[PDB]
Design a protein around this ligand. Structure first.
Ligand code: 7O3
Length: 273
């Protein structure tokens, strides 16, 4: 049973706004009894789905429904007791962060980009302190609203932990590639990659290098260079997230504190590499 179960009559499905693993993402309208109608995004599961597909689809809604944070995509409702099965979230006008930035190259100031990163780190602090590992933290899995508020999304690979031993290569920590051992520290590595994506206006990490080239480079202690005009302190935070020893990486609480100090100390963001 889902606390956020909604009657199907409450949702009105409009245009397709994206694609998902199990089906399309649509823009829609949600009308809860005695409440003003809101715009929503709707994840659907294509007709003729297998029982495994349904279970996997809904496991995302189960993880999501456990979260209530500004920087974690809000679950507005789920449809499981009726057809079609749906996951209904708050509408994010600007979609995925990586493509939003590529389509808006040089549109935002360093402080605006830092504000976006602070929100992601706050969402990840909450997620990790709820004892979860995301395992798929990438700018493409971050959604952006009209006011540049960034929210962690795509909880399919998320796991309750403190290590998750498995049975997204250029975003994955080297120990997680080598041993299939995922922790909050391996999510911190992914976060460092997201920082690089944001300060690069959505450039692909490691550019045209193959997954194999990335694995080899990381093993040879290569680290991505600072993006154009990136403050030294922000690239240093990226390098801290990318320490070989996972225990040496900052925790998400520290990352938030660091970004909060930069936002308040303009001199800290006033020196390039
Ligand atoms: O408006 C645009 C133009 Cl790119 N795109 C989108 C695409 C997907 C969206 C989205 N997806 C989503 C993600 C999940 O992890 C679970 C459920 C859903 Cl519905 N949620 C909110 N807003 C969106 C906006």
């Amino acid at each position: 049973e889902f606390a956020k179960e909604i009657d199907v009559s409450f949702v009105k499905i409009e245009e397709v706004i994206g694609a998902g693993e199990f089906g399309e993402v649509y823009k829609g309208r949600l009308k809860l009894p005695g409440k003003r109608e809101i715009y929503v995004a709707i994840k659907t599961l294509k007709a003729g789905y297998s029982e495994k597909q349904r279970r996997d689809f809904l496991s995302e809604a189960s993880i999501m429904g456990q979260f209530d944070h500004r920087n974690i995509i809000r679950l507005e409702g789920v449809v499981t007791k009726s057809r079609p099965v749906m996951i209904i979230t708050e509408f994010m006008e600007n979609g995925a962060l990586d493509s939003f930035l590529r389509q808006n190259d040089g549109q935002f100031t360093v402080i605006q980009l830092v504000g976006m990163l602070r929100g992601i780190a706050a969402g990840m602090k909450y997620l990790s302190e709820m004892n979860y590992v995301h395992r798929d933290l990438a700018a493409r899995n971050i959604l952006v609203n009209s006011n540049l508020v960034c929210k962690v999304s795509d909880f399919g690979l998320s796991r309750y932990l403190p290590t998750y031993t498995s049975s997204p290569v250029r975003w994955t920590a080297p120990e997680a590639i080598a041993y299939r051992k995922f922790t909050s520290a391996s999510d911190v590595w992914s976060y460092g990659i997201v920082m690089w994506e944001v300060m690069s206006f959505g450039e692909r990490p490691y550019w045209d290098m193959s997954n194999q080239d990335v694995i080899n480079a990381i093993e040879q202690d290569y680290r991505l260079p600072p993006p154009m005009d990136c403050p030294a302190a922000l690239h240093q935070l990226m390098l801290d997230c990318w320490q070989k020893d996972r225990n040496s990486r900052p925790r998400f609480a520290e990352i938030v504190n660091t970004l909060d100090k930069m936002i308040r100390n303009p001199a800290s963001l006033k020196t390039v590499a």
